[PDB]
Amino acid sequence: SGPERITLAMTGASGAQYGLRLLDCLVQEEREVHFLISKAAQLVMATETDVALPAKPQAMQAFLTEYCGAAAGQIRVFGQNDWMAPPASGSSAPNAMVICPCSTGTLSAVATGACNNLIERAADVALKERRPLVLVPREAPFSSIHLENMLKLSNLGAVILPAAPGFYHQPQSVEDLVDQVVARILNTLGIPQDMLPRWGEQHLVS
Amino acid sequence: SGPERITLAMTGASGAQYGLRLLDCLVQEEREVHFLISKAAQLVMATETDVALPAKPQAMQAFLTEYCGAAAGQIRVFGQNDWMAPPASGSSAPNAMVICPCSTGTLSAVATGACNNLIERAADVALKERRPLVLVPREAPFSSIHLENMLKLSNLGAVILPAAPGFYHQPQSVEDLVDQVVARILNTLGIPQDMLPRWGEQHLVS
Amino acid sequence: SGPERITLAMTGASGAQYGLRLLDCLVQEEREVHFLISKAAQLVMATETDVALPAKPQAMQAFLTEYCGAAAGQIRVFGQNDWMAPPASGSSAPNAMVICPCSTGTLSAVATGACNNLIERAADVALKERRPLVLVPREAPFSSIHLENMLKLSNLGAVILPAAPGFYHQPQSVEDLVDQVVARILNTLGIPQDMLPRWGEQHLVS
Amino acid sequence: SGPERITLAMTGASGAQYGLRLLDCLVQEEREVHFLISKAAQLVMATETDVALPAKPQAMQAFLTEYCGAAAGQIRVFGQNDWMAPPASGSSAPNAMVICPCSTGTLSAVATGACNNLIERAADVALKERRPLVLVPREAPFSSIHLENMLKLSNLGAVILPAAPGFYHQPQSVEDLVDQVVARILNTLGIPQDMLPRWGEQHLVS
Amino acid sequence: SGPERITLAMTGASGAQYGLRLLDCLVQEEREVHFLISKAAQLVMATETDVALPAKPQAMQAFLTEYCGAAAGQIRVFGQNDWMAPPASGSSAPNAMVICPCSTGTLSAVATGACNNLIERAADVALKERRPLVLVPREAPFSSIHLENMLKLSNLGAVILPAAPGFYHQPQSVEDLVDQVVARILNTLGIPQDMLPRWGEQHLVS
Amino acid sequence: SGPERITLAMTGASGAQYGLRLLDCLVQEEREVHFLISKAAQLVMATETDVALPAKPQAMQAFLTEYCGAAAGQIRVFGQNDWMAPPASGSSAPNAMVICPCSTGTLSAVATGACNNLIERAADVALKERRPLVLVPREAPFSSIHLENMLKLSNLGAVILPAAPGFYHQPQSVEDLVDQVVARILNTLGIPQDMLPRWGEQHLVS
Amino acid sequence: SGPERITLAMTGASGAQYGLRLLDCLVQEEREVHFLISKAAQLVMATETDVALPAKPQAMQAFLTEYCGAAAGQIRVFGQNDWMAPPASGSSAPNAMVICPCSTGTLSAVATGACNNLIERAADVALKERRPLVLVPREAPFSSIHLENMLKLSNLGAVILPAAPGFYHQPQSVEDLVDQVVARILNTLGIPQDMLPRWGEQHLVS
Amino acid sequence: SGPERITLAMTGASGAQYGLRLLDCLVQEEREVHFLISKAAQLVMATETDVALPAKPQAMQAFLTEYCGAAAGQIRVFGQNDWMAPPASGSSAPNAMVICPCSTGTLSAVATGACNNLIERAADVALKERRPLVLVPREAPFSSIHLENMLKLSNLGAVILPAAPGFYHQPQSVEDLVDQVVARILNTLGIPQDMLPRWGEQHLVS
Ligand SMILES: Cc1cc2c(cc1C)N(C[C@H](O)[C@H](O)[C@H](O)COP(=O)(O)O)c1[nH]c(=O)[nH]c(=O)c1N2
Ligand SMILES: Cc1cc2c(cc1C)N(C[C@H](O)[C@H](O)[C@H](O)COP(=O)(O)O)c1[nH]c(=O)[nH]c(=O)c1N2
Ligand SMILES: Cc1cc2c(cc1C)N(C[C@H](O)[C@H](O)[C@H](O)COP(=O)(O)O)c1[nH]c(=O)[nH]c(=O)c1N2
Ligand SMILES: Cc1cc2c(cc1C)N(C[C@H](O)[C@H](O)[C@H](O)COP(=O)(O)O)c1[nH]c(=O)[nH]c(=O)c1N2
Ligand SMILES: Cc1cc2c(cc1C)N(C[C@H](O)[C@H](O)[C@H](O)COP(=O)(O)O)c1[nH]c(=O)[nH]c(=O)c1N2
Ligand SMILES: Cc1cc2c(cc1C)N(C[C@H](O)[C@H](O)[C@H](O)COP(=O)(O)O)c1[nH]c(=O)[nH]c(=O)c1N2
Ligand SMILES: Cc1cc2c(cc1C)N(C[C@H](O)[C@H](O)[C@H](O)COP(=O)(O)O)c1[nH]c(=O)[nH]c(=O)c1N2
Ligand SMILES: Cc1cc2c(cc1C)N(C[C@H](O)[C@H](O)[C@H](O)COP(=O)(O)O)c1[nH]c(=O)[nH]c(=O)c1N2
Ligand SMILES: CC(C)=CCOP(=O)(O)O
Ligand SMILES: CC(C)=CCOP(=O)(O)O
Ligand SMILES: CC(C)=CCOP(=O)(O)O
Ligand SMILES: CC(C)=CCOP(=O)(O)O
Ligand SMILES: CC(C)=CCOP(=O)(O)O
Ligand SMILES: CC(C)=CCOP(=O)(O)O
Ligand SMILES: CC(C)=CCOP(=O)(O)O
Ligand SMILES: CC(C)=CCOP(=O)(O)O
Ligand code: NA
Ligand code: NA
Ligand code: NA
Ligand code: NA
Ligand code: NA
Ligand code: NA
Ligand code: NA
Ligand code: NA
C-alpha cells in the first residue's frame, strides 16, 4: 500500500533531520526514492547535523545508500538541472512527491509555477498530473506572503504539512519529535508506520 | 522595553509546554500576566504534562503564582465568562496578547469575530484597538480553512507564529525546542530573552 | 469496497429518518460506524420519529446496537466533548464522514472551521486529512449565507448532497424517498446498495 | 393578498409532481397562471407521472384547464419561442415567477443570462424588473457549479428554494412531502395555504 | 402600517436602554413582540440599568408585561434553546426582527450563519425568508472584522443601524439620545413614531 | 487498472483524428465506451478525415464497432437528447469521461453548467459525482474567456489536456503526434499504453 | 506621551459637540492642534450648538484660542484650499489626524483618494506617510457604500471609531456621552485622559 | 506591413521546430530578428533536432545567419545577461516579441514580473510599453497554475497562442503541423504568410 516511488526533495529550511529520517523510513518500507537536494539545503545539513553529505550526485547516491542500508538502485540522486530525470516530465512513471523541509523560497516558487531547478519542475509536474505533493514548511512567523502561497497550493490539492510536531504522546527527545512529523508524512502518503499510533483506536464509548 | 502587561491565553492545541514556559519567562521578566485558559486546554495540560492545574481561577492563580515564583498580583487568572476582566474591554489598559498554543477552533473564532468566551473577546478587543496579538497555532496538516483564517488575521496585523521550532542551534532536548519557540514569541513582543542568540551578530563580512 | 469505518454524525436538521436509515444500511454492509449526534438532533428525533433514543452514549450505543441488529463493537457512540475519540485526531485510522442530516448551523461551523464540539472537530479533521466528507443539508429556502458555506466546502472537496430526493423511480411511500437519498450517499461513499438501480445500465443505443 | 398572476415554468428536473401540485393550488386560490414547460420537462412528466399532457400549447391549455378545474382563461399556456407572450417583456403586467422544478441546466441559463427560450427570457425579465423569482432546484449532489449559480441568483434577489421537504410534521405519504414543498413556495409568494401550519403560533412562553 | 409582529432580540452590547425603550414603543403601538435576550445581555442590563429583570422566561414575561403596560399575550418571551418558538422556523408567521443592541459576537454569528442559540437561528431564518432584519451594533472602534461582517449582511438585505445618535434636534438628556435611535429603528420598520420629526417637511423652497 | 467504462465525447473542434485514435486505443484495452458526438463534430470529421461516419446512433454504432474491431456491445452510441442513457444520471454506474477534441463552445457550456445536450449533461454529472473528466481543447489563440473557463474547471478537478503534442520523442509523422496526445490521455485515465515511454525510467543518477 | 501635534478636522456630520470637546481636551493636554473645518461643518455647528464660530481662519483662530483657553500659536486654523499648510505635504512634521465628526461624504473622499480640499489632502497625506488617522463617522443606517469605504480604510491602517457611545459607566447627561467618545479617541491617540477609567484595572481574579 | 523588428525568444519547452521555422519565415520576410535562447532551450534543440547550434552568441549568430540565408546584421543574438541589448530597455526601438516555444517556467516568470534573464526582462519591457507579446506555451495537461498565469497575461494584452495545431487543412507531415502554428503566429503579428490560407475567403453565401 502507498506509492512505490517517492520523489523526496530537501530545500534550505531548518529541519534537515526531518528529511533524513523520512528518507530512512522510506527505505525501510522498501520504497524507491528519487532524492533531490538544493544547494542551500546542503549548507543547512552541514550546519545542523553531523552528516557529511558528498556534493555530487553519484558520490551522494553511494553515501546515502550506505547511510540508510538501502538496496542497489533503491535511492536515485538527481542534480538540480538534470532534465532527463523522471521527475522532470509528466510522462514519467507516477511518483508521490515530498518537499521536506520546504523553504519559503521553494514554497513561493511552487506556488507561482517558477521552474528554476529540478525540485521546482518536479513539483510543477506533480500538480499538473495531480500526483501527490506534500510540502513541509519550516518558518516562524508565517507572513501573509507565506500564507497566501500555502493557501493557493492547498486549494490546488497539495498537502501543507508544517514541521509543527504534536506533544500528545509525551515526547522524551528531539528524535521523538522528528519521528512524530515523519509519521504524519507517512500517514499522508498512505505508507505504513509504527511511530505514531492510531488515535483512540481502542476507545469504544465515551 | 516591551509590554508591561501580557494577556496569555492557552487553548486546546497540543503544546501545553509552550504556554507554561512562556508564562514562566514572562514572570522572570517582571511582567504582569493576565492568564486565560480554555476548558479543552485544561484537558490537554493534564494529558501532556505532569502539571496538576487547579480548575477554578483563584486556586489556579495561587498555584501558578507558586509554580513560577511570581510576586503577589503578578499573575491574574480570569474565568472564561468574566466580562469584568480587563481584556474584555478596549477601554482597559493596553496589553499585548498571545494565544499559545492556539487551536484551529480558536483560530477560526478570532478570524470570524466570534466572541463565545473571554479568550475570543480579548482577541477581538486586541484587533479593534490594534494592540499586539500573537497566535501560536499547532496543527498538521494545515487545511485551506486553517490557512484562510491565518491569512485573514495576518492581513489584519496579527502575528501568525506556528509552533514550528528551528534546528539551527543544535537542539539537544525537547526543552531546547520549546525554548526556541518561546524565544521567538518574546522577540516578537519586544521582550528580552537570552535563549535564542541574535543571528550573525558578530558576522562582519562574508 | 468502500470505507471500512464511517463517522456518521446527525445534527438538528429535519430528516432524522435519513440518518437512522443510513445507519441501518451501513450496519447491513458490515461497516464500523462511529456515531455522533448533537443535542438539537436528539430533539428532532424525538419530535419526528417514534425512536426513543437514550441520552447517554453507552445506553445510546446499546440501544442502537439492538435497533439495527449490529454486532458487538460495530457501532461506537462518542459524546460531544470526547476528544479521546478517534474522529478528533488526524492521527486516527482513516474514516469516511457523513453529516446526515446537516443543519445550517453545523454547515456554517464546518465552513468556518469552528470546532465547538466533536462533530465539528471531526469534520475539520476530515478536511485537513482529505478524507471523505459528505454533508446532507436540509433547509428551504437556501440563503446566500447557506450557499456560500456550501460552495466553500464543495470547493475544498466536501460533497454537498442535499436531502432532495428524485422521483424518477416512481416512489410509493415516504420510505421510498428516504431510501433514495440514502442510496445516493452510499453511492458517493462507494458502498454497495440495491435500493437505487444504475441508470440506463441496459440501455445499449438510442 | 399575494400576486394576481404567476408565471409557472416547469423544466426537466425530477419532481414533476411539485409543479402540477403547485399549479393546482394556484388555481384553487383563483390566480391567473402563465404556464411554461420545457421539452425535457415533458419527458420527465411522462416518465414520472400518469399525467398524459398534450404536446401543443392549446391542447395542453385545454387539458390543464380540465385537470385543475380552472375557469376559462385562468391558465394560459405559451410555447417556448412565443416572444409575443407577456413574460417575454418587462413592459408586461407584473407577475411573480416560479421555476418548479428547476433543472441545473435552466439554473445555469438564468444565472448567466442566457435567453435561449421563453422560460429563460421570462426569468431574465423578472430579474431586471425586480419581480419575484423562485427557483426550485432538484439535484444531488450539488456541484460547485450548481452552488455558484444559485449563490449568484440568491445575491440578486431570487429565492433558491430546493425540493428538500422537511419531516417535522410527521409526513405519511409522498403527497404529504409534495404538499410541504408547495406550501413553502406559496408562503414565499405570499399566497394563502393551509397545508403547512404556522410554526409555534400558539407557543406563548418556553 | 408596519409589521404586526416583531422579534426583538437583545444581546450583550452596551446600550440596554435602547432595547428597553424600543420594547416600550412597540407595546404602545399595539405590536406583538417576541422577546429574546442573551445571557450576556442580562449581565449588561443589571450593570447599566436599575431594571431587575427575572431570569426565567415566564417570570421575565410577567415582569416585562407589567413594566411596559402590555396586554396579556402581547409580549412573548422565549428561552435561548426553545426551538419550538415561532422565530426558529421559516414556516412561522412573518415577523420583522431587530437585534438591539447587537454585540460584535452576535454580529459575527449572523454573518457566518452560526446557529448556536435562538437569537442566531431567528436571524438566520429572517435572512432566508427575506423578512426584515435590523442590527443595532454598539462598538468602537469598528475593526475590519466587524466591518466585513456588517458589509456582508448589508449586502444581503439586513439593515445595519448603529447606535450612533444624531444631535441635529438639540438633545437635552440621555433619554433624548436613546429616543433618537429608537425612532430611526421604528422608521426603518415602517412603524409610526412622534419622537423624531420628518426632516424638512415644511421646507418648500430654498 | 483504470476505468472499466469511458464516456468518450467528440465535439466540433479540429482534431477529429485524436478522438478516433483514442476510441481505437480504448477498444484495444477492452474498455466499454459510451460514445457521444455533436452535430458540429460530425461536420469536422467529414472535412478532416476520410471516415464516413453514419449519422444515426445505431448505424453509427455498427460502423464504429467494425472500424475498431470491437466486441458486440463494447461501443454504445447515444444521441444528443437521449436522457435515458447512463451518462445523463449520477445514479449510473461510474464512468470516466473524455471530451476529445473539446470545442471552446463545449468548454464554455461545461464551465457554466449549461446542459443543452447529452455531452454537456454528462460532463455536469461527472463533476457533481467527482468522476474523472478530461477536456482536450483545440484552439489558438486562447482568449481570456477560454482561459477563465479552463481555469474554473481545472480548479474543480477537471483535467485540461490541450491538443499540444510534445516533440521530445522525435515524431516522424502526423500519426506520431496524434499518438502522443492520446497516450497522455490514457496516462491521465490510468489506462496502459505503450506509445509514450515512461520518461527517464532507466536514468539512475545524473 | 502621544502625538505633539494633531490635525483635527471637522466635517458636516451631526455631532459637532464631539469635535469641540475633543479640541478642548487636546488643548488641556498642551498639544498643538491644526484645525480644519468644512463649509458644511460650519452649518452643522450653527444648527446644533450655541457656538458662534467666525467664518474666516484668522478670526476663527482667535475665537477658538479664547474659547478653549489655549496659548498663543497652540491652535492653528487653515482654510480649505491652503496648500501651504503643513497637513498638505508628507514632508511636514509628523501629526496625528482625527476627522471628528466624519461625514459619509468625507469618508468616501478619503476612501477613494479624492483630494478636493485640505481635509481630504491631509488624510491622503496621513495614509501615504502611515501617520495616525482616526475617522469618527456619524450616520445611521450604515449603507453598504459606507461600510465598504470604512472597511477599505480600516484595512489600510485607519481607525474607524464611530460616534457610538457606550453606556457601561451610567451616563447622566449628553455631556457624559460626548466625553465617553472623546475619551476613546484620546485613548486611540495615546493621549492621557481621566474621563474614561481603565476597565477592570483593580479586578484581580474572577 | 507588420513589425520591422521581432524579438524571438526560445525557452526550454518541447517544440524547438516551431521556433526555428518561425525564425526562417521571419528572415524570408526581410525582418530584423533579435534572437534570444535560454540554456534549457539549447538542451531541447540538441535533443529534438539535428541542428547543432553553437553555444556562444557570436558563433550562434554566424551559424543562424547561414542556416536561414539571412543578410548581414539581419539576425542579432544576445546573451541571457546582456542588459545592453535593445530588448532590455523600453527606450529601445519598438519590437514585437514572441516566446516560441514558451516553457511554463518562463510563462510564470513573465506573469509575475520576474526579471532573472534577458528573455524575462524583454517580456517585462514589452508589457510596460504595450508592444506586442506572443507566448507559445507547450505543455499538457495545463495546471491551474499554468492557466492563471496565462489568464493574467492575456488580460494584460499578451497573446496566448498554444502550440496546438489545427487539422482542418489535411496535414500530411509533421512539417505541415509546424507550419500551421507558425502561420498563426505570423497572422497574429500582421506579417504576410502563404502557408495558411484565409478561411472561407471565396465563400460568398451559404
Ligand atoms: C542554516 C540555515 C537555516 C535556514 C536557512 C538557511 C540556512 C543557511 N534558510 C534560508 C534559505 O536557505 C534560503 O532562503 C535559500 O534561498 C533557500 O533556497 P532553496 O529553497 O533551498 O533553493 C531558511 N529559510 C526558510 O524559509 N526557513 C528556514 O527555517 C531557514 N533556515
Ligand atoms: C490531548 C488533545 C490534543 C489536542 C486536542 C485535544 C486534546 C484533548 N485538540 C482538539 C481541541 O482541544 C478541540 O478542537 C477544542 O474544541 C479546542 O477548544 P478551544 O479552542 O481550546 O476552546 C487539538 N486541536 C487543534 O487544533 N490542534 C491540536 O494540536 C490539538 N490537539
Ligand atoms: C424539530 C426541529 C426541526 C428543525 C430544527 C429544530 C427542531 C427542534 N432546526 C433548528 C436546529 O436544530 C438549530 O439550528 C440547532 O442549533 C442546530 O444545532 P446542531 O447543528 O445540531 O448542533 C433546523 N435547522 C436547520 O438548519 N434545518 C432544519 O430543517 C431544521 N429543522
Ligand atoms: C426522467 C428525467 C429525470 C431527470 C432529467 C431528465 C430526465 C429525462 N434531468 C436532465 C434534464 O432533463 C436535462 O439536463 C435537460 O437538458 C434539462 O432541460 P431544461 O432545463 O428542462 O430545458 C435532470 N436534470 C437535473 O438537473 N435534475 C434532475 O433531477 C433531472 N432528472
Ligand atoms: C457590561 C458589559 C458591556 C459590554 C459587554 C459585556 C458587558 C458585561 N460586551 C461583551 C459581550 O457581552 C460579550 O462579547 C458576549 O460574548 C456577547 O454575547 P451575546 O452576543 O450577547 O450572546 C460588549 N460587546 C460588544 O460587542 N459591544 C459592547 O458594547 C459590549 N459591552
Ligand atoms: C472544420 C471545422 C473546424 C473547426 C470548427 C468547425 C468546423 C466546421 N470549429 C467551430 C465549432 O464547430 C463550432 O463552434 C460549434 O458550435 C461547436 O459545437 P459543439 O461544441 O461541437 O456542440 C472549431 N471550434 C473550436 O473551438 N476549435 C476548433 O479548432 C474548431 N475547428
Ligand atoms: C444639520 C446637518 C446635519 C447633518 C448634515 C448636514 C446638516 C446641515 N449632513 C450632510 C452633510 O453636511 C453633507 O453631506 C455635506 O456634503 C458634507 O460635506 P463635508 O464632508 O463636510 O465636506 C450629514 N451627513 C452625514 O454623513 N452624517 C450626518 O449625521 C449628517 N448630518
Ligand atoms: C527535452 C526537454 C523537453 C522539455 C523540457 C526539458 C527538456 C530537457 N521542459 C523543462 C524545461 O526545460 C525546464 O522547466 C526549464 O527550467 C525551462 O527553463 P527556461 O524557461 O527555458 O529558462 C519542458 N518544460 C515545459 O514547460 N514544457 C515542455 O514541453 C518541456 N519539455
Ligand atoms: C523533460 C521533459 C520531457 C519535459 C516535458 O514533460 P511533459 O510532457 O511536459 O510532462
Ligand atoms: C466589558 C466591556 C466594558 C465591554 C465593552 O468594551 P468596549 O467599549 O467595546 O471596548
Ligand atoms: C485529540 C487530538 C490528538 C487532537 C490532535 O490531532 P491532530 O494531530 O491535530 O490531527
Ligand atoms: C418581446 C419584447 C417586447 C421584448 C422586449 O421587452 P423589454 O422592453 O426589453 O422589457
Ligand atoms: C424548528 C423548525 C421547524 C425548524 C425548521 O424550520 P424551516 O423549515 O427550516 O424554516
Ligand atoms: C436522466 C436522469 C435520471 C437524470 C437525474 O440524474 P441525477 O439523480 O440528477 O444524478
Ligand atoms: C503642498 C505640497 C508640498 C504637497 C506635496 O507634498 P508631498 O511631497 O507629496 O508629500
Ligand atoms: C538596460 C536599461 C536602460 C534598462 C532601463 O530601461 P527602461 O528605462 O526602464 O525602459
Ligand atoms: Na525559470
Ligand atoms: Na457568541
Ligand atoms: Na471553539
Ligand atoms: Na441565445
Ligand atoms: Na452550532
Ligand atoms: Na438548457
Ligand atoms: Na480633485
Ligand atoms: Na531577479
Residue numbers in the entry:
A (entry chain A), B (entry chain A), C (entry chain A), D (entry chain A), E (entry chain A), F (entry chain A), ...: 2 to 207
Sentences from the paper on this structure:
Originally thought to be redundant but distinct decarboxylases, it has been shown that UbiD is in fact the only decarboxylase, whereas UbiX produces a cofactor strictly required for UbiD activity. The UbiX enzyme catalyses both the N5–C1′ and C6–C3′ bond formation to generate the fourth ring of the prFMN product.
In an attempt to further probe the DMAP/DMAPP specificity, and explore the putative role of the (pyro)phosphate in Friedel–Crafts C6-alkylation, we constructed F181Q (to mimic AnUbiX) and F181H (to mimic O157UbiX) PaUbiX variants. In each variant, the DMAP specificity was retained, and crystal structures of the corresponding complexes with oxidised FMN and DMAP revealed little difference with the WT PaUbiX structure besides the mutations itself. This clearly demonstrates the nature of the residue at position 181 is not the sole determinant of DMAP/DMAPP specificity. In PaUbiX, F181 appears to block binding of a beta-phosphate containing DMAPP in PaUbiX. In contrast, the F181Q mutant does not proceed beyond the N5-prenylated intermediate. Despite the relatively modest changes that occur between DMAPP-specific AnUbiX and DMAP-specific PaUbiX attempts to bestow DMAPP activity on the latter by mutation of F181 were unsuccessful. Instead, the F181Q mutation in particular affected the ability of PaUbiX to complete the catalytic cycle and resulted in formation of stalled N5-prenylated species.
